[PDB]
Symmetry: C5
Subunit: 146 residues, 5 copies
Amino acid sequence: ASGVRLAIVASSWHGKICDALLDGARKVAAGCGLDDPTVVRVLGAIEIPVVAQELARNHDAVVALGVVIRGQTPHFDYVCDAVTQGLTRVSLDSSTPIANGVLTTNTEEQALDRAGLPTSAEDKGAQATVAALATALTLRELRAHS
Amino acid sequence: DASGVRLAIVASSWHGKICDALLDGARKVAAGCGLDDPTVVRVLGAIEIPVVAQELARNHDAVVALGVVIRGQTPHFDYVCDAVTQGLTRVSLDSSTPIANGVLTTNTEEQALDRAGLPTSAEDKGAQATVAALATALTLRELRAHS
Amino acid sequence: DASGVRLAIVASSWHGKICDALLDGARKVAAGCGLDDPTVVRVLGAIEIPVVAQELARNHDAVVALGVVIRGQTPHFDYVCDAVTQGLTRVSLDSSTPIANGVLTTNTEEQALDRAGLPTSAEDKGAQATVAALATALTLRELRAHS
Amino acid sequence: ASGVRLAIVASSWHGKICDALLDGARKVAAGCGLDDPTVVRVLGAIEIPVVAQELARNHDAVVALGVVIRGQTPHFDYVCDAVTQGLTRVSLDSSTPIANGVLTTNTEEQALDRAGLPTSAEDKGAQATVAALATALTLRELRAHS
Amino acid sequence: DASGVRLAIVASSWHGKICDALLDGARKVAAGCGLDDPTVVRVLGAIEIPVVAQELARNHDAVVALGVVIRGQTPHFDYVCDAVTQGLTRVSLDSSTPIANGVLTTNTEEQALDRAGLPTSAEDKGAQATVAALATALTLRELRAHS
Ligand SMILES: O=c1[nH]c(Cl)c(CCCCOP(=O)(O)O)c(=O)[nH]1
Ligand SMILES: O=c1[nH]c(Cl)c(CCCCOP(=O)(O)O)c(=O)[nH]1
Ligand SMILES: O=c1[nH]c(Cl)c(CCCCOP(=O)(O)O)c(=O)[nH]1
Ligand SMILES: O=c1[nH]c(Cl)c(CCCCOP(=O)(O)O)c(=O)[nH]1
Ligand SMILES: O=c1[nH]c(Cl)c(CCCCOP(=O)(O)O)c(=O)[nH]1
Ligand SMILES: [K+]
Ligand SMILES: [K+]
Ligand SMILES: [K+]
Ligand SMILES: [K+]
Ligand SMILES: [K+]
Ligand SMILES: [K+]
Ligand SMILES: [K+]
Ligand SMILES: [K+]
Ligand SMILES: [K+]
Ligand SMILES: [K+]
Ligand SMILES: [K+]
Ligand SMILES: [K+]
Ligand SMILES: [K+]
Ligand SMILES: [K+]
Ligand SMILES: [K+]
Ligand SMILES: [K+]
């Protein structure tokens, strides 16, 4: 994957968990021969699609990282609807994979469990970067050459 | 920071005290960041915000959307929140412009009060949404064309 | 006052009595604001509104959507309300024209009656939507080009 | 209303219920004096929008007929979501009424009761055709003419 | 006789054994209808299907979408299914190409196995989706311009 132009946009709402996701994505990127992907920080998940849209203009793949955790109101449902709709539209408008590393949990421990910390069951940042890179390589192979 | 950003704020009026409080928070953040004169526009309800947001996005770096939807006796709340979600999301991507989320969507009036940055509120979504708008605008300025 | 704005109203007919009442509300607000002859068009059910509202938006500053969707025995209500929600939101932004929300989405007949501005009704969604349509039309006029 | 150009697309999943919807639609078009409508069969509700899109290029109105009955899984919800987004989009892209004749029920009993059979409470194939026809005529009047 | 139709199949790999069974059902229908060599592409998860389906749609009469989403401990399952639903629906209509539904969306693994055309499965979702794809391609063929 050393030739792929990779972008990562990570939100900052719930800082420790977001850093963990990013750390996972970067390590997968580096392990695949990419030492310097484009990394951009935004505040919350609502801000990801617009930044992903900009990044997709000149990258083969964008990894979307963030953490939405349910509060006391229906607001959680609408934040996740907005991000779902936006990323989906961005990937199709740009014909570019936007990988899903945006945790959507009922609880904080569930998010921690999926963030790739030493005792976590899995790592979404890593998983989303693999998805982005595999899908970019597939698309490159399907498209025009040579 | 933030003094060159062209900010717009669109605020509904459906629950007066709450709406005015969100708008105050948005405006105080803008002033704190060197923005004394953002474009401020008022609409009746949340459903009116997207079309007005769309107009504003043509000549601003960021738009803050403020409103309050509180659940009543019917499914109506669900559809109002869906319309706004789809609309703001479409607007931000059609215009490549941050549309910051300061629209409260609550089960109770208590909860909305608690999130509007009134004296005894736990938090202020109006202030938070303005931080998001300004920061994303600045990020986009950095990402886009300059030499 | 809105004596210069071009208003259209599209009202469905499924549940006639409540629909006529919504229309009455809409027309009264219109007349009170200086508009005695808005464009009024009738459609069968709520699913017909967006396509007609689309046509009306090409020739008006605001469209008021009126209708009544009352829950039955099946999930069907959800998908009818979903469709109207997506459509009207699309139409408003495609045409950059306010499409005002006067479409009741209720669990019972009692609830729709209570929101249709009949004599003993708690409120009048037709009136409310119409105020939203005109105030938004006027706001947009002030925002857009004039010399 | 004898001058409107009418197309009907019906899915075949739950065949007995689908035919009764179609018969209801056919009776209303015949009673309103139409030149026999363009009638197309598709397998399930999921296929309706893409065929509706084709028919909409050559017709004043499309009647969409189908039956979705909830099963053991959440699949029902997503099937109904797809058809909702699709037809809505098709009607607005083409500026053409796409009438609602898609039953979305919990049980087979409920579908039967809405399919215009002798002991049925309602006739949705009929209801949808009236809506299509009336909306076609309304748009014809709103649009440009002498 | 579908020997003339250009068929693509995109299948995810999340839950490998089940995806493979779905693919096998698809292939068998395809081969039974005269198509020994359809375009087959593997993607990681269901989120990746729309963008690849879009690419396939430029060069094919029909695309079959195969995949498996099984609900976990969080609301994540709902959003993943919302994304796939919206994406595929958008792709079929942008490109006017049948995109057949072979994406399982189940609460349990047991449910998904039962729908995947295994020896003891109640039904075969892969086979079903392919019949839908091919049949819809043929219909569109007769509906469109020919002599
Ligand atoms: O990126 C993000 N993440 C999260 Cl967790 C939230 C808040 C989730 C909503 C919880 O708040 P409550 O519903 O007001 O208690 C957000 O807005 N944006
Ligand atoms: O900006 C807004 N805010 C709110 Cl709270 C509503 C009504 C919420 C619906 C509650 O009332 P009920 O469902 O009729 O009891 C709106 O339409 N537009
Ligand atoms: O404008 C409208 N209004 C209403 Cl109330 C309906 C019926 C929705 C409820 C259906 O009843 P069920 O068939 O028992 O679910 C509609 O289709 N179109
Ligand atoms: O036109 C249609 N109709 C119906 Cl009823 C279905 C399946 C309903 C899904 C129920 O099955 P289960 O959820 O697997 O038990 C479809 O796909 N397409
Ligand atoms: O193609 C797919 N399939 C599936 Cl099953 C998933 C997992 C959805 C369930 C996630 O588990 P949770 O994190 O425990 O909610 C996916 O992301 N992509
Ligand atoms: K790109
Ligand atoms: K929680
Ligand atoms: K990690
Ligand atoms: K702008
Ligand atoms: K309440
Ligand atoms: K405040
Ligand atoms: K730059
Ligand atoms: K207009
Ligand atoms: K009822
Ligand atoms: K009234
Ligand atoms: K102006
Ligand atoms: K047409
Ligand atoms: K059932
Ligand atoms: K005319
Ligand atoms: K094609
Ligand atoms: K499970």
